[PDB]
Amino acid sequence: HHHHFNLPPGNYKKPKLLYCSNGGHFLRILPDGTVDGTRDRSDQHIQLQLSAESVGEVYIKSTETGQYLAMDTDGLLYGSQTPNEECLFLERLEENHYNTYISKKHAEKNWFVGLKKNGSCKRGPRTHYGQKAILFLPLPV
């Protein structure tokens, strides 16, 4: 493995919001496949359903649109209509509290899901362990 195996304590029974501490945005997957963040808790595209493919490996799906979160070969997040290898993330505990999501496809590169303070997503190569951008908290919908 390229990464530790500390797992968060939550579960996949309910959908969640993924809140990023960095700028205080919720991860959003828009109908046209765009991925960004918003602080609007009333947005209909921030409700996400996580599911485990293997222990610690997840899909992250928009409940409104059905799209899967995915990271492409240049490190950009996008919404995928179908599950593919780019849609699997290694979900881990971080700093004894937060959830992080590493691209499984790009795990050797340490490419994370992350949000900037201005609510734009991070590109994979601009992410790294230690950043605030990569830290999420799952919140009830």
mmCIF file of C-alpha atoms in Angstrom:
data_model
loop_
_atom_site.group_PDB
_atom_site.id
_atom_site.type_symbol
_atom_site.label_atom_id
_atom_site.label_comp_id
_atom_site.label_asym_id
_atom_site.label_seq_id
_atom_site.Cartn_x
_atom_site.Cartn_y
_atom_site.Cartn_z
ATOM 1 C CA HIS A 1 0.000 0.000 0.000
ATOM 2 C CA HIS A 2 0.955 3.631 -0.513
ATOM 3 C CA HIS A 3 -1.092 4.908 2.452
ATOM 4 C CA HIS A 4 -2.014 4.292 6.087
ATOM 5 C CA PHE A 5 -5.204 2.449 7.103
ATOM 6 C CA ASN A 6 -6.714 4.580 9.848
ATOM 7 C CA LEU A 7 -10.471 4.556 9.015
ATOM 8 C CA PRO A 8 -13.094 7.074 10.092
ATOM 9 C CA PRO A 9 -15.880 5.962 12.424
ATOM 10 C CA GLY A 10 -18.893 6.946 10.475
ATOM 11 C CA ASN A 11 -20.942 4.743 8.100
ATOM 12 C CA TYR A 12 -22.717 4.906 4.790
ATOM 13 C CA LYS A 13 -26.320 4.458 5.901
ATOM 14 C CA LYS A 14 -27.372 8.052 5.156
ATOM 15 C CA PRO A 15 -26.323 10.660 2.635
ATOM 16 C CA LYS A 16 -23.939 13.366 3.802
ATOM 17 C CA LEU A 17 -22.574 16.817 3.076
ATOM 18 C CA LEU A 18 -18.778 16.923 2.745
ATOM 19 C CA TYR A 19 -17.765 20.120 4.501
ATOM 20 C CA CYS A 20 -14.254 21.495 3.938
ATOM 21 C CA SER A 21 -12.724 23.398 6.825
ATOM 22 C CA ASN A 22 -10.414 25.353 4.522
ATOM 23 C CA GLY A 23 -12.904 27.954 3.143
ATOM 24 C CA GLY A 24 -16.091 26.439 4.767
ATOM 25 C CA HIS A 25 -17.516 24.992 1.531
ATOM 26 C CA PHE A 26 -19.587 21.942 0.831
ATOM 27 C CA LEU A 27 -18.402 19.750 -2.074
ATOM 28 C CA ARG A 28 -20.789 20.150 -5.012
ATOM 29 C CA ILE A 29 -21.321 18.103 -8.178
ATOM 30 C CA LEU A 30 -23.406 20.150 -10.645
ATOM 31 C CA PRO A 31 -25.643 18.672 -13.358
ATOM 32 C CA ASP A 32 -23.197 19.556 -16.156
ATOM 33 C CA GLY A 33 -20.387 17.555 -14.440
ATOM 34 C CA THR A 34 -18.653 20.549 -12.867
ATOM 35 C CA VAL A 35 -17.254 20.038 -9.338
ATOM 36 C CA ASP A 36 -16.696 22.968 -6.951
ATOM 37 C CA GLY A 37 -17.690 24.149 -3.497
ATOM 38 C CA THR A 38 -20.524 26.255 -2.144
ATOM 39 C CA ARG A 39 -21.365 27.688 1.264
ATOM 40 C CA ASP A 40 -25.109 27.525 0.437
ATOM 41 C CA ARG A 41 -26.482 24.756 2.631
ATOM 42 C CA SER A 42 -29.688 25.007 0.553
ATOM 43 C CA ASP A 43 -27.991 23.840 -2.619
ATOM 44 C CA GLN A 44 -29.490 20.682 -4.129
ATOM 45 C CA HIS A 45 -26.194 19.395 -5.516
ATOM 46 C CA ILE A 46 -24.239 18.998 -2.268
ATOM 47 C CA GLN A 47 -26.087 15.908 -0.982
ATOM 48 C CA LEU A 48 -23.793 12.937 -1.485
ATOM 49 C CA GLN A 49 -24.232 9.245 -0.929
ATOM 50 C CA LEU A 50 -21.049 7.322 -0.108
ATOM 51 C CA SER A 51 -20.763 3.535 -0.501
ATOM 52 C CA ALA A 52 -17.991 1.045 0.157
ATOM 53 C CA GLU A 53 -16.624 -1.088 -2.680
ATOM 54 C CA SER A 54 -13.972 -2.591 -0.455
ATOM 55 C CA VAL A 55 -13.057 -1.726 3.106
ATOM 56 C CA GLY A 56 -11.858 1.909 3.010
ATOM 57 C CA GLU A 57 -12.616 2.307 -0.732
ATOM 58 C CA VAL A 58 -15.630 4.416 -1.645
ATOM 59 C CA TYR A 59 -17.766 5.834 -4.376
ATOM 60 C CA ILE A 60 -19.098 9.369 -3.776
ATOM 61 C CA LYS A 61 -22.388 9.865 -5.631
ATOM 62 C CA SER A 62 -24.683 12.840 -6.117
ATOM 63 C CA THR A 63 -28.116 11.922 -4.887
ATOM 64 C CA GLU A 64 -29.731 14.627 -7.047
ATOM 65 C CA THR A 65 -28.133 13.671 -10.338
ATOM 66 C CA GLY A 66 -26.658 10.191 -9.891
ATOM 67 C CA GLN A 67 -23.180 11.307 -10.965
ATOM 68 C CA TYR A 68 -20.081 9.820 -9.388
ATOM 69 C CA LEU A 69 -17.231 12.027 -8.216
ATOM 70 C CA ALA A 70 -14.130 11.180 -10.272
ATOM 71 C CA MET A 71 -10.588 12.487 -10.780
ATOM 72 C CA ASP A 72 -9.227 12.515 -14.322
ATOM 73 C CA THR A 73 -5.719 11.801 -15.587
ATOM 74 C CA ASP A 74 -4.659 15.441 -15.176
ATOM 75 C CA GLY A 75 -5.993 15.569 -11.610
ATOM 76 C CA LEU A 76 -9.233 17.396 -12.241
ATOM 77 C CA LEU A 77 -12.424 16.457 -10.431
ATOM 78 C CA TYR A 78 -15.492 15.816 -12.580
ATOM 79 C CA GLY A 79 -18.880 14.189 -12.414
ATOM 80 C CA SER A 80 -19.049 10.821 -14.157
ATOM 81 C CA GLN A 81 -22.307 9.293 -15.401
ATOM 82 C CA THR A 82 -20.993 5.768 -14.779
ATOM 83 C CA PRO A 83 -18.631 4.243 -12.228
ATOM 84 C CA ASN A 84 -15.092 3.743 -13.516
ATOM 85 C CA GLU A 85 -11.603 3.368 -12.043
ATOM 86 C CA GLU A 86 -11.391 7.170 -11.630
ATOM 87 C CA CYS A 87 -14.361 7.139 -9.244
ATOM 88 C CA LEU A 88 -12.825 5.096 -6.405
ATOM 89 C CA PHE A 89 -11.381 6.952 -3.432
ATOM 90 C CA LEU A 90 -9.488 5.770 -0.388
ATOM 91 C CA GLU A 91 -11.403 7.204 2.529
ATOM 92 C CA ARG A 92 -9.184 7.745 5.593
ATOM 93 C CA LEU A 93 -9.174 9.405 8.976
ATOM 94 C CA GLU A 94 -6.812 12.396 9.173
ATOM 95 C CA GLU A 95 -5.471 14.395 12.112
ATOM 96 C CA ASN A 96 -7.440 12.025 14.328
ATOM 97 C CA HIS A 97 -10.711 13.710 13.228
ATOM 98 C CA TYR A 98 -11.328 14.529 9.558
ATOM 99 C CA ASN A 99 -11.990 12.440 6.469
ATOM 100 C CA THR A 100 -9.658 12.556 3.488
ATOM 101 C CA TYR A 101 -10.187 11.051 0.036
ATOM 102 C CA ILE A 102 -7.240 9.867 -2.086
ATOM 103 C CA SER A 103 -7.735 8.933 -5.700
ATOM 104 C CA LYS A 104 -7.222 5.136 -5.848
ATOM 105 C CA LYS A 105 -6.128 5.298 -9.491
ATOM 106 C CA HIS A 106 -3.508 7.952 -8.581
ATOM 107 C CA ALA A 107 -2.757 6.764 -5.049
ATOM 108 C CA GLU A 108 1.009 6.577 -5.674
ATOM 109 C CA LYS A 109 0.958 10.293 -6.559
ATOM 110 C CA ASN A 110 -0.860 11.335 -3.343
ATOM 111 C CA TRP A 111 -3.710 13.063 -5.248
ATOM 112 C CA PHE A 112 -6.514 14.107 -2.919
ATOM 113 C CA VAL A 113 -9.981 15.596 -3.172
ATOM 114 C CA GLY A 114 -9.612 19.153 -1.949
ATOM 115 C CA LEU A 115 -11.257 22.558 -1.918
ATOM 116 C CA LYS A 116 -9.490 25.961 -1.911
ATOM 117 C CA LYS A 117 -10.519 28.801 0.308
ATOM 118 C CA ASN A 118 -12.318 30.405 -2.650
ATOM 119 C CA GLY A 119 -14.430 27.283 -3.237
ATOM 120 C CA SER A 120 -12.584 26.008 -6.341
ATOM 121 C CA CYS A 121 -11.403 22.433 -6.359
ATOM 122 C CA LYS A 122 -7.740 21.590 -6.110
ATOM 123 C CA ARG A 123 -6.015 19.806 -8.948
ATOM 124 C CA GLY A 124 -4.499 16.476 -7.804
ATOM 125 C CA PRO A 125 -0.812 17.463 -8.093
ATOM 126 C CA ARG A 126 -1.453 20.618 -6.029
ATOM 127 C CA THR A 127 -2.693 18.540 -3.086
ATOM 128 C CA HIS A 128 -0.507 16.891 -0.474
ATOM 129 C CA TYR A 129 -0.590 15.531 3.018
ATOM 130 C CA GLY A 130 -0.610 18.285 5.578
ATOM 131 C CA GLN A 131 -2.935 20.658 3.764
ATOM 132 C CA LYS A 132 -6.145 22.098 5.101
ATOM 133 C CA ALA A 133 -7.788 21.794 1.630
ATOM 134 C CA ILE A 134 -7.963 18.018 1.888
ATOM 135 C CA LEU A 135 -9.784 17.843 5.229
ATOM 136 C CA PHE A 136 -13.513 17.114 5.233
ATOM 137 C CA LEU A 137 -16.198 16.500 7.808
ATOM 138 C CA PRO A 138 -19.234 14.476 6.855
ATOM 139 C CA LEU A 139 -22.380 16.313 8.012
ATOM 140 C CA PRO A 140 -26.000 15.121 7.971
ATOM 141 C CA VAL A 141 -28.249 16.344 5.145
#
